[PDB]
């Protein structure tokens, strides 16, 4: 994120980091329950990537971080490579996350819901801090 | 050219497709919602993360970091998948597996 502040450790407990076997982080994700993560389609997760919940400082080794595995990657059939539409993908956890006080879950809106423009929402992640 | 160590956060507003379209024009689609141009910008490594909004005191998933300016410009809108539009799909899948 560019121009963001650093978070208060554990305050966005649903946020996971998706990483490759060699540890490299390529996309964020968010927990919707003990077994499912919602990430973006174009992230291109596979059953060989690992979901990592509980982390805040990716530099610190000493952290109660759960390092889960992917059972099934569900790419949304309607996602578009070219228009980037319907860019969503669910990940079925091979092994459920233990919800702690640093590993909580986010709430899905209702298809019926309407978030008015101007509403101050928040976004999080470990992406570049400057291009 | 390296990502942050500690997790980051930023507060930004939602835009009206209309207003977002003032920038992206027709590249904006139905299952897309915009937020930003407020001086903060999602950037490389953030995709598939969340844009959450406080609904009934509860943080709700409103979008997934998707795309935007190619240099993470903080003056243009960031475009996220619109969860309210995909939520149906989310449920059919959860409910089937």
């Amino acid at each position: 994120i560019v121009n963001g502040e650093e978070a208060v450790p554990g305050s966005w407990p649903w946020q996971v980091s998706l990483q490759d076997k060699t540890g490299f982080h390529f996309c964020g994700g968010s927990l919707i329950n003990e077994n499912w993560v919602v990430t973006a389609a174009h992230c291109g997760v596979t059953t060989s990537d690992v979901v990592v919940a509980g982390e805040f400082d990716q530099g610190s080794s000493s952290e109660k971080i759960q390092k889960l595995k992917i059972a099934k990657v569900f790419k949304n059939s309607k996602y578009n490579s070219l228009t980037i539409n319907n860019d969503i993908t669910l990940l079925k956890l091979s092994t459920a996350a233990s919800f702690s006080q640093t590993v909580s879950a986010v709430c899905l809106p209702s298809a019926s819901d309407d978030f008015a423009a101007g509403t101050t929402c928040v976004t999080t992640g470990w992406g570049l801090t400057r291009y | 050219a390296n990502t942050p160590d500690r997790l980051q956060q930023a507060s930004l507003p939602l835009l009206s497709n209309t207003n977002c379209k003032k920038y992206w024009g027709t590249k904006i689609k139905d299952a897309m919602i915009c937020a930003g141009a407020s001086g903060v910008s999602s950037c490389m490594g953030d995709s598939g993360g969340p844009l959450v909004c406080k609904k009934n005191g509860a943080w709700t998933l409103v979008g997934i970091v998707s795309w935007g300016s190619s240099t993470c410009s903080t003056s243009t809108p960031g475009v996220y998948a619109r969860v309210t539009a995909l939520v149906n799909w989310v449920q059919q899948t959860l409910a089937a597996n």
Binding site: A7, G10, S11, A105 | -
Partner: peptide, 11 residues
Amino acid sequence: CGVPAIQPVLS
């Protein structure tokens, strides 16, 4: 869901 244990800040 949506209620974290440690409250987030400046949000």
